[PDB]
Amino acid sequence: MEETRELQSLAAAVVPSAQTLKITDFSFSDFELSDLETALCTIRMFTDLNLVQNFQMKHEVLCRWILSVKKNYRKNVAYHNWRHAFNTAQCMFAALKAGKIQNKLTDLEILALLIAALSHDLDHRGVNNSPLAQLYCHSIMEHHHFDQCLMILNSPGNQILSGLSIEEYKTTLKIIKQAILATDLALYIKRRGEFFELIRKNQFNLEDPHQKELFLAMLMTACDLSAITKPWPIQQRIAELVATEFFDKNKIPSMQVGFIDAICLQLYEALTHVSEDCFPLLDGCRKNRQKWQALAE
Ligand SMILES: CCCOc1ccc(S(=O)(=O)N2CCN(C)CC2)cc1-c1nc2c(c(=O)[nH]1)CCC2
Ligand SMILES: [Mg+2]
Ligand SMILES: [Zn+2]
Numbered sequence: 001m002e003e004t005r006e007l008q009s010l011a012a013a014v015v016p017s018a019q020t021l022k023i024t025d026f027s028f029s030d031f032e033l034s035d036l037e038t039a040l041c042t043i044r045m046f047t048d049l050n051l052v053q054n055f056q057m058k059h060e061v062l063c064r065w066i067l068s069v070k071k072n073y074r075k076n077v078a079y080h081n082w083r084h085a086f087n088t089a090q091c092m093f094a095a096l097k098a099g100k101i102q103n104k105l106t107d108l109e110i111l112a113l114l115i116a117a118l119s120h121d122l123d124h125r126g127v128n129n130s131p132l133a134q135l136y137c138h139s140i141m142e143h144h145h146f147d148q149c150l151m152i153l154n155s156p157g158n159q160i161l162s163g164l165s166i167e168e169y170k171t172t173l174k175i176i177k178q179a180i181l182a183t184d185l186a187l188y189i190k191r192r193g194e195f196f197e198l199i200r201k202n203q204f205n206l207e208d209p210h211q212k213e214l215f216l217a218m219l220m221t222a223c224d225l226s227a228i229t230k231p232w233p234i235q236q237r238i239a240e241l242v243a244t245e246f247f248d249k250n251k252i253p254s255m256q257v258g259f260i261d262a263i264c265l266q267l268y269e270a271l272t273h274v275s276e277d278c279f280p281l282l283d284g285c286r287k288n289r290q291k292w293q294a295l296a297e
Helices: 002-012 035-048 059-071 082-096 107-119 140-153 166-181 185-200 209-224 232-247 252-274 276-295
Strands: none
Touching: 002 035, 002 059, 035 059, 035 082, 035 107, 059 082, 059 107, 059 140, 082 107, 082 209, 107 140, 107 166, 107 209, 140 166, 166 209, 185 209, 185 252, 209 252, 232 252, 232 276, 252 276
């Protein structure tokens, strides 16, 4: 089979260092990478976050899990596909390392963010595709993604959480679930005020469980949207993909400016306040606003 073949190549490979793979960079890009290569980067992300060790993940199982995740994104979807999930994970990784967020969180939280970033759009069909009620929003889409995530975590050969104790397992699933549900922009809009207001007053505090949970949610949105922060030539390219999905052009630049003002700037400003080293995200986002604004006329 084409697929057990893919599993063999992947399990046999030597995983280059994080530095060699450029996965520590906020300006990372996946355009020139093969599927196999994105899988290796992903293993390096688990490894250098020290998650394979702390939680005793078997190599064959992690490899199989990554391939399952990859397999359950649809390639025919121009933007909401595996590369988007892979990029969201890479940005999470870079915020934890380069952005120095790692030290602010527990191992279990880090574990759950990485998994959530990779799984958060599982089985997406495209924004233009959409039982009972369904009456009041409620993140139906994200519930589906999380269910997909859960089913893969429980598939034979795919159980990367088997090394956790039952109590750790339950805590981790809860975090994964909240994390995936947090990628619903509506929820993000609903909750950001609290977070901004708190940073305003220099009252923000990670020791408060309520605030921790709020921060993790903000963190997910920041990664989920991070394409908006990439170097111009790359951002233009990703914008291309999004437009293809949204519509299957003269108004696109102003749309981009609207999106950056409405959603992105404040979030990346807030994240910078929490950790100054996440500044490149904010900086990259500002430069892109300037560029799209110039096209907008
Ligand atoms: C480039 C084509 C047009 O792109 C957009 C147009 C509108 C918006 S939006 O007004 O903030 N918005 C549209 C309605 N959604 C449910 C939420 C997002 C975002 C985007 C948009 N979203 C994303 C990116 C982007 O470049 N544009 C990259 C990360 C996600
Ligand atoms: Mg989504
Ligand atoms: Zn997403």
